[PDB]
């Protein structure tokens, strides 16, 4: 029974195809060895000996030129021992997704892209592709997943994201995904800038 190693991703959990992302496990407890498990299309466990600085052990795992297999729920385990790998509690799960595999969707803003403060804005994401689910990203990273609507009268598959009352602007992007390949996402929606005018 050991404390959960903390796993984070630099730059972010969204990684483009043929691009590189770094995943780091840090823990106040000092493990000589760090382990990382992926659940998905390709299950693999990667080992790197821990680097001990200050009073916190850390380890930088590199996910290479991004491909489909390297996407999934990554969990980091730690061990002070060597051969038996007496293992720590699982890290909090981190889902790494690949972007750019499928066609790009479209992002709209009702009422409008530029809005006064307090006026609630509901961004919407639509595409002709039969995407089962749409995902929204603010400033390069967000966690808002909503299911797609049925084949709309216009022939579209759409999901409405209610941002709520807007006081701080931001650049939002939208991605599309299927149920069969959950951690495999589409191209990026052309960025939309919510602009707040305040008096």
């Amino acid at each position: 029974v050991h404390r959960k190693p903390s796993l984070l991703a630099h730059p972010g959990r969204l990684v483009k195809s043929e691009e590189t992302v770094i995943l780091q496990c840090w823990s106040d407890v000092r493990f000589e060895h760090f382990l990382l498990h992926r659940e998905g299309k390709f299950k693999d466990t990667l080992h790197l000996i821990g680097e001990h600085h200050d009073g916190v052990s850390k380890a930088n795992f590199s996910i290479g030129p991004m491909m489909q297999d390297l996407a999934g729920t990554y969990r980091c385990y730690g061990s002070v021992t060597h051969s038996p790998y007496q293992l720590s509690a699982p890290s909090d799960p981190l889902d790494i997704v690949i972007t750019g595999l499928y066609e790009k969707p479209s992002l709209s803003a009702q009422p409008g892209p530029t809005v006064l403060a307090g006026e609630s804005v509901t961004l919407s994401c639509s595409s002709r592709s039969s995407y089962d689910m749409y995902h929204l990203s603010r400033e390069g990273e967000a966690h808002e997943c909503r299911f797609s609507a049925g084949p709309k009268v216009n022939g579209t598959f759409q999901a409405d994201f209610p941002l709520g009352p807007a006081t701080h602007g931001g650049t939002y992007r939208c991605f599309g995904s299927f149920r069969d390949s959950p951690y495999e996402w589409s191209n990026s929606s052309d960025p939309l800038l919510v602009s707040v005018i305040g008096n």
Partner: antibody
Framework: QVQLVQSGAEVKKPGSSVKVSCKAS????????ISWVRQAPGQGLEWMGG????????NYAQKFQGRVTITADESTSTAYMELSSLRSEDTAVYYC????????????????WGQGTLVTVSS | GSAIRMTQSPSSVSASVGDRVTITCRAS??????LAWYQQKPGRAPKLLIS???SLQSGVPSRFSGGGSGRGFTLTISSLQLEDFATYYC?????????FGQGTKVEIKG
């Protein structure tokens, strides 16, 4: 001097089940990621599946999922492959090999191999 | 992503000793440099010759040389020798559906 010893050649009837053993020597069993490759008269080489390194779980190919289970035991230092429903076309030589790893999570190749076990599905 | 299909060529070859032969392996998708060439002599298990498209494993003669990138790859045996005569395959290491080429057979005429 990492080398792999496979179980002896076996001959079974259609509908039966076959279990092939892959003995590991020359290193830590947990570090190795072992995969099973089938060479059939009519099929050059096919990757049936493999075991993940440390935790011993398995990835399977879609064609062979449902009839193939790949297991391992650390104490035995041996991997196993089991074909549930034998079919006449499954007659082939079955190899076990360690797939090497490299930077970025990629695996680049299968460096070590085994002598192979031949199953012959005869009525 | 459907199974990355490797189309290997030629299907068979007959040549002489001290000879040069090239084997080409084409992919449906782009596998980068993540290709491998294997050699299998009869009975004996297949042996890895070249990894990472161009990296040669230990104990491999320099006459065995291979190159390529993206979707096109080659394997060039500069000086053919008797022990070289076998069947050669190519494998993609990109996406999980790991697929091998059909194979190329090298034979001595004598």
């Amino acid at each position: 001097q990492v080398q792999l010893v496979q179980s002896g050649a076996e001959v079974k009837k259609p509908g039966s089940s076959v279990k092939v053993s892959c003995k590991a020597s020359g290193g830590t069993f947990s570090s190795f990621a072992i995969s099973w490759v089938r060479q059939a008269p009519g099929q050059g080489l096919e990757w049936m599946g493999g075991i993940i390194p440390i935790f011993g779980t398995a990835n399977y190919a879609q064609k062979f999922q449902g009839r193939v289970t790949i297991t391992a035991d650390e104490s035995t230092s041996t991997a196993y492959m089991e074909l549930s429903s034998l079919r006449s076309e499954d007659t082939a030589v079955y190899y076990c090999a360690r797939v090497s790893g490299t930077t970025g999570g990629y695996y680049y190749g299968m460096d070590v191999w085994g002598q192979g076990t031949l199953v012959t599905v005869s009525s | 992503g459907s199974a990355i299909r490797m189309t290997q060529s030629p299907s068979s070859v007959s040549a002489s000793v001290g000879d040069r032969v090239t084997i080409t392996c084409r992919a449906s998708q782009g596998i980068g440099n993540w290709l491998a060439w294997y050699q299998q002599k009869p009975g004996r298990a297949p042996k890895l010759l070249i990894s990472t498209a161009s990296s040669l494993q230990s104990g491999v003669p320099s006459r065995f040389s291979g190159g390529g990138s993206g979707r096109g790859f080659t394997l060039t045996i500069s000086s053919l020798q008797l022990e070289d005569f076998a069947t050669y395959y190519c494998q993609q290491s990109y996406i999980t559906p790991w697929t091998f080429g059909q194979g190329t057979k090298v034979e001595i005429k004598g």
